[PDB]
Design an enzyme around this catalytic site. Structure first.
Site, mmCIF file in Angstrom:
data_model
loop_
_atom_site.group_PDB
_atom_site.id
_atom_site.type_symbol
_atom_site.label_atom_id
_atom_site.label_comp_id
_atom_site.label_asym_id
_atom_site.label_seq_id
_atom_site.Cartn_x
_atom_site.Cartn_y
_atom_site.Cartn_z
ATOM 1 N N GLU A 25 7.567 -18.788 -28.860
ATOM 2 C CA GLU A 25 8.719 -19.239 -28.100
ATOM 3 C C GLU A 25 8.671 -20.736 -27.762
ATOM 4 O O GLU A 25 9.714 -21.346 -27.530
ATOM 5 C CB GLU A 25 8.878 -18.384 -26.823
ATOM 6 C CG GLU A 25 9.207 -16.911 -27.114
ATOM 7 C CD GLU A 25 9.118 -16.003 -25.891
ATOM 8 O OE1 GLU A 25 8.241 -16.233 -25.013
ATOM 9 O OE2 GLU A 25 9.938 -15.057 -25.821
ATOM 10 N N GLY A 91 15.683 -8.151 -24.658
ATOM 11 C CA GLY A 91 16.281 -6.915 -25.127
ATOM 12 C C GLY A 91 17.704 -6.807 -24.584
ATOM 13 O O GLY A 91 17.948 -7.017 -23.380
ATOM 14 N N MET A 185 10.644 -9.656 -19.534
ATOM 15 C CA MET A 185 9.441 -9.456 -18.728
ATOM 16 C C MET A 185 8.984 -10.647 -17.946
ATOM 17 O O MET A 185 7.891 -10.604 -17.387
ATOM 18 C CB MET A 185 8.318 -8.994 -19.672
ATOM 19 C CG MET A 185 8.714 -7.740 -20.430
ATOM 20 S SD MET A 185 7.262 -7.115 -21.615
ATOM 21 C CE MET A 185 5.979 -6.483 -20.276
ATOM 22 N N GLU A 186 9.781 -11.724 -17.882
ATOM 23 C CA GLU A 186 9.371 -12.912 -17.133
ATOM 24 C C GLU A 186 10.442 -13.602 -16.285
ATOM 25 O O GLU A 186 10.101 -14.266 -15.296
ATOM 26 C CB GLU A 186 8.775 -13.977 -18.052
ATOM 27 C CG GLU A 186 7.539 -13.532 -18.844
ATOM 28 C CD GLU A 186 7.871 -12.778 -20.113
ATOM 29 O OE1 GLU A 186 8.980 -12.978 -20.685
ATOM 30 O OE2 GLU A 186 6.995 -12.009 -20.547
ATOM 31 N N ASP A 209 16.261 -7.434 -29.889
ATOM 32 C CA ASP A 209 16.300 -5.986 -30.063
ATOM 33 C C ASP A 209 17.251 -5.381 -29.038
ATOM 34 O O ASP A 209 17.795 -6.103 -28.192
ATOM 35 C CB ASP A 209 14.918 -5.374 -29.893
ATOM 36 C CG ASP A 209 14.303 -5.665 -28.516
ATOM 37 O OD1 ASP A 209 14.580 -4.920 -27.553
ATOM 38 O OD2 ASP A 209 13.559 -6.656 -28.417
#
Ligand SMILES: Nc1ncnc2[nH]cnc12
Ligand SMILES: Nc1ncnc2[nH]cnc12
Lengths: 245, 245
Positions: A25, A91, A185-186, A209
């Protein structure tokens, strides 16, 4: 004191943190900047660059809320960042987001934060808030950049938790409970930290996704390309932030 | 350079962070110290004291992994802490722990950290570890203190997550998956941060409940008394750490 009005073109106080969660990233960020130094600190490497009158601090945090909180806090408190931009993958929850689409966070929640045994809503703890708000000026700037690029960029609520979600039932609960268009997740951890430190922040994600049974495979297929999509936009944001009147 | 061997009795570099999650967990600490200053920073208040040749920084983080990570990082990076002690309450998993019993963490995991869709074990992310180890010297010191106090203090694995667990099925999964004797919402986050920064840490919890359907009521009943139990032991630890040869 004399200020001639052009000093910002030569050197200003602004220091822009640019962060991702994973090496894939941020490497496209470091490729655009080209030249930089690195410092080993807090179990990680923080890269620094002199860029058109401001300074950049760039790093990947490692995955999840704790590591991303630590990197955000480190960039501000130790490396002196005054603005923070996050670039990475996410996601999709909303059906209007597909692989590669960019989403800018309006605000973020932590979908796994749960003290509901005490009658508080999901995502809340005392002295906190269900949502933390991304910076309005940077969101406006992102609209300007999207048009200049000729790119369609959605704005919405992003939900953050310490789970890779590969399950429609969980995905749908998160969407319904928080009105979230995407999950990751962050972002929300980073936001809470920036907010605590009065640092404006901006979270950008490119979809990798759809957070379902096929999430891990899609993630593998599209990690590099989605990560590059986010990173390209982020560098355009940086050029804009350097250009402020 | 001349060192006479007694300088540490007058002023040393050691700076001890003492942290809880909630005001009830640190107020008994601030009562023992009695005199201190306070600084508003990172959306919180950090109290500082000059204590027998060392300095103390004390604060409560607010609840959960993100806030506790932020406070731990802040105490080290901004307030210059070199050791960290955490004092608070926890939910018992092991049947040998009852309300009020103290447990010292040997090591800690994050029970809600889940990227198992990629075949990693629960609690793991790349470049991380399932467990983070508490400092062995301080664990030994805690044995010395427990005997001096005539108190029975268990040692075990503590599992951390961003949920108040009031559910035997979840409780039992956590116990089985991680071998955990107790659960809580900050310890493992604090440990990861201290570990990243090479700061030795020590996590102490006094049991407030058994993480079952009655957890919230027990927690309310025993918060103050359990919090005081943890805090008393922690101040004894501080006196020991100041006494090191
Ligand atoms: N399905 C997913 N869950 C959590 N984080 C993600 N980042 C990208 N895809 C994700
Ligand atoms: N049951 C519980 N779950 C999470 N954290 C706690 N702290 C004290 N009791 C707890």
């Amino acid at each position: 004191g004399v200020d001639l009005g052009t000093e910002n073109l030569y050197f200003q106080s602004m220091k822009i943190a640019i962060m991702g969660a994973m090496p894939e990233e941020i490497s496209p960020i470091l490729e655009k900047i080209g030249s930089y130094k690195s410092t080993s600190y807090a179990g990680n490497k923080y890269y620094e660059a002199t860029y058109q009158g401001v300074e950049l601090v760039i790093a990947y945090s490692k995955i999840g809320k704790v590591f991303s909180a630590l990197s955000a806090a480190t960039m501000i408190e130790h490396f002196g960042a005054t603005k923070l931009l996050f670039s990475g993958v996410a996601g999709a929850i909303s059906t209007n987001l597909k692989v590669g689409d960019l989403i800018v966070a309006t605000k973020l929640s932590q979908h796994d934060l749960d003290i509901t045994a005490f009658g508080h809503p999901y995502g809340y703890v005392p002295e906190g808030s269900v949502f933390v708000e991304a910076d309005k000026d940077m969101i406006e700037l992102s609209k300007k950049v999207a048009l200049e690029m000729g790119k369609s960029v959605q704005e919405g609520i992003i939900a953050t938790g310490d789970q890779f979600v590969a399950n429609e039932e969980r995905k749908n609960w998160i969407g319904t409970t928080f009105g979230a268009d995407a999950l990751e997740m962050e972002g929300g951890s980073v936001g809470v930290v920036c907010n605590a430190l009065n640092i404006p922040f901006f979270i950008l994600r490119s979809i990798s996704d759809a957070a379902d049974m096929d999430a891990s495979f899609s993630f593998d297929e599209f990690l590099e390309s989605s990560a590059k999509e986010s990173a390209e936009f982020i560098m355009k944001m940086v050029d804009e932030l350097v250009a402020l009147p």
